[PDB]
Amino acid sequence: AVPKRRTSKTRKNKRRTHFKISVPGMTECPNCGEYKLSHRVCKNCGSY
Amino acid sequence: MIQQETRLKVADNSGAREVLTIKVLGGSGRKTANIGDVIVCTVKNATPGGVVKKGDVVKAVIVRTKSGVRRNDGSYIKFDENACVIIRDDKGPRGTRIFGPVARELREGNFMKIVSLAPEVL
Amino acid sequence: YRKLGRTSDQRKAMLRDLATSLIISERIETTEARAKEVRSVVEKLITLGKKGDLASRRNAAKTLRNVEILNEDETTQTALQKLFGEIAERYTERQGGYTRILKQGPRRGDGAESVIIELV
Amino acid sequence: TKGILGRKIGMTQVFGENGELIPVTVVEAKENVVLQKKTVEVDGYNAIQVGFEDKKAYKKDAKSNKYANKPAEGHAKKADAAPKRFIREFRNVDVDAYEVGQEVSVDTFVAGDVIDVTGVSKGKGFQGAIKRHGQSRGPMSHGSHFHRAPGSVGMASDASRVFKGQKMPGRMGGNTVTVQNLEVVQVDTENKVILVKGNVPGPKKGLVEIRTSIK
Amino acid sequence: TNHKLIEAVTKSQLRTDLPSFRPGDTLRVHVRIIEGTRERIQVFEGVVIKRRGGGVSETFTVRKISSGVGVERTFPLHTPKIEKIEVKRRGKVRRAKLYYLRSLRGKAARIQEI
RNA sequence: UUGGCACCUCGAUGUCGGCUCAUCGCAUCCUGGGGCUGUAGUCGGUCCCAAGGGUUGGGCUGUUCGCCCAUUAAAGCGGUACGCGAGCUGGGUUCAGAACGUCGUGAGACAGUUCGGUCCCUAUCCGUCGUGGGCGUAGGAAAUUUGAGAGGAGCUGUCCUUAGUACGAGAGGACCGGGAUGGACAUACCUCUGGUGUACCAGUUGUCGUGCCAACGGCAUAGCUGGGUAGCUAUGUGUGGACGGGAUAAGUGCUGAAAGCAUCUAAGCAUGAAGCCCCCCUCAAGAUGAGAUUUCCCAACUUCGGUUAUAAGAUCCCUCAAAGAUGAUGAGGUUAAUAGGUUCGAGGUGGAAGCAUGGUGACAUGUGGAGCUGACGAAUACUAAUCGAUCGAAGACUUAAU
């Protein structure tokens, strides 16, 4: 139930090495505008 | 499927009207029985007179389960109640007036006397 | 089929109110899973409209809510009359389709994939 | 001797001598070819390998598996063949038969051969202890809060650890398994099927390995 | 071609001799019984309770009362141990599965004609 | 085991049984093999070898225990904090209530009964059951494999023949062999039997609503009720244990001295068990010893520091399910049948609406195996799998043959 020992600063940072985030789609909209998310229709600042 | 403590109608004039199973004899751990399987059983409702009386422990063969048997040709047979014939420890019965239909699947269990004392076998 | 996070009647009531409003406005903005499932609902309901007989008029009213469209020149047709009268005349040659799903970005309160479902 | 590859079509039944109903798994063992012959002088063991279901050739912008890649073209070009989806070795066979490129057809088996059929299981996902293993569940009443848990996992402090092989929950899984001593009942040459008596592991349109019985 | 293989392989063992019936109909099933002696034929007259899923695994079920004891009997429809089926009497039912007759005994388990 | 001692723990080592899950000894309960017998046979007895596997269900008692009814080839004995409560119950007992017996003047007490009496914890680490990512495996890939190893399995009855033979005065009744089948168990699968099947079909009650009739709709556990596809499923279907090899235990020997003999042992040579090693089934090169085969790919700039790009190959993303918590796995991504839709089926329900006829009606009959149908099958590009983007090798030395 409770942790018997504290986790160190080293063990904590080894656990959250897969606690990351990915870069998204980022495809250009060839008609007009900035980068749209891939396989998505744009809403603002683009023509998809 | 006939296990311990199932009430069965008794299908002859052996002296019993209702009987409940103690064990399904056969092997060790044997849980259920069907047509052709001998069970050891105590009579609960007995006819006044006859041979067996209430509280006797008798051996008896299963005829006509409600969850009947499957045949080699993919055929099935099922009955509307579970019945039973009290036997006399040589695969021969106690009575001479076996009641109701008997399944065919106990011809090959050497219960030919039970077949000959019965109505139409199906 | 998808359960959409609701009961058998909460899903059924949600799915025919979402199919009625895609007959009224002809393009609605929903989430992605709720548009994957109302896709097969309204396309099976335009199929009843291309028939146009009385027996399938009774079947399209199993599904459609009693919503009145204010059309042009202050004339009012119901969503049952607008299904057999306008959408049924548009797709009388097409053998399927009748909708499309255009994906959009996540919402702000959720990561819910926004989707426009249109009526083609 | 006598290995072949197929896939599960489904399950039916057949009547036989004196009208006996026998259950039947139809296996479409179609378009198997001998694709590489292996020798002890090169590899250390004698086997052939059979490629089962041919797929489409090399395409430049191919994004899925039904178009072969360039190693699978050149491997199935050293035999005059089309590239196959499934490739399995058979080492119970005699290597001195089976020239490389032979269409090993469905009439290598006769009605009455005993065989082994190898396939994966279905795969049930993450399952618990009384489903993944045949464990007795706890009582559902009489105050109890133990129903479908595993029981104790060890002894107290002699063995202050859990022994491995504990039979805990996890993935029930599609893993390979053989059913042995099945019969071939009917070989339809024109449909290229085998009717094997009983049931074989795997889902429909899976992959079987019908080879003769080692027992 | 997946879809023909269930059909085209088991096709030559399906039958054509059998009449047309449905649940509610009274049948005379001429099943043949082979012991070690001969090839005797016994008739089973009953009322069709059930007809289920198609193919060569078409399966019907008739119901008889023998000695005060009702008897269910279930056959593969295409088995080669049914020599003959006679439709004795038709029946006016409104179900496909007549399982309510299992709790009805005597004149209450009566099924009309045509 | 009952104790003895008081060493660990009283700033807690928390509970007797039972349940779930076991695991280990062998001083062996059954099955295997032997010796001896006051072993005719059938049965036994006793001792030795052996842990492979198996070792029931009830009645009474809170009971451990014990008795008893049934069985069974047998219903082994022990150890694991009298195994296991951060896995479960709480009947037993050290709680407050109350009562009897008994004791006490009494308050009370008994270790005598009797009725009643709150079972906390979101798992940090180790350990286990699954599953990914990273890197390594001296080029990079795709695919098939070797098996060092590890794991699983391993039980047994009954019957028939041999043969009423051997044996026996008789009664009885064999070994060895052969064959058939089971029980228990373990697996795979949904064809059958069934179960479920909350987007399938039908019936029906109440009430509200769609103006009304008729048709429907909402709610009433899915309102109930009758069924039921796909899928999941057992109680349903299939298989499995086997053989067979080596080496041995107890044992049985052959030859054979030492010790002219004798002697199973000393040198030799055999034989010998459910045991041991294979055989059988899985999993396995992170097997850092990183294996092997087949196929594919081959760069220049350039203090080659590195960059720029890329090959084969992948991946992002998108359509999905034979896969799945996730992600992995698999089917696909326009040269496309991946999913939906459409069309046609299969199976299911059991005769739609509307109309007509008949009936005073409630309702019947016809139109018509009718309508409807979620997951199943086929066809069809109608809709959506867009455009894109990212990653990815250049083959080190040393010596030896060539």
Ligand SMILES: [Mg+2]
């Ligand atoms: Mg970090």
Ligand SMILES: [Mg+2]
């Ligand atoms: Mg509701």
Ligand SMILES: [Mg+2]
């Ligand atoms: Mg239990």
Ligand SMILES: [Mg+2]
């Ligand atoms: Mg504990």
Ligand SMILES: [Mg+2]
């Ligand atoms: Mg001291």
Ligand SMILES: [Mg+2]
């Ligand atoms: Mg010993």
Ligand SMILES: [Mg+2]
């Ligand atoms: Mg603890």
Ligand SMILES: [Mg+2]
């Ligand atoms: Mg008190």
Ligand SMILES: [Mg+2]
């Ligand atoms: Mg006193």
Ligand SMILES: [Mg+2]
């Ligand atoms: Mg109380």
Ligand SMILES: [Mg+2]
């Ligand atoms: Mg309301």
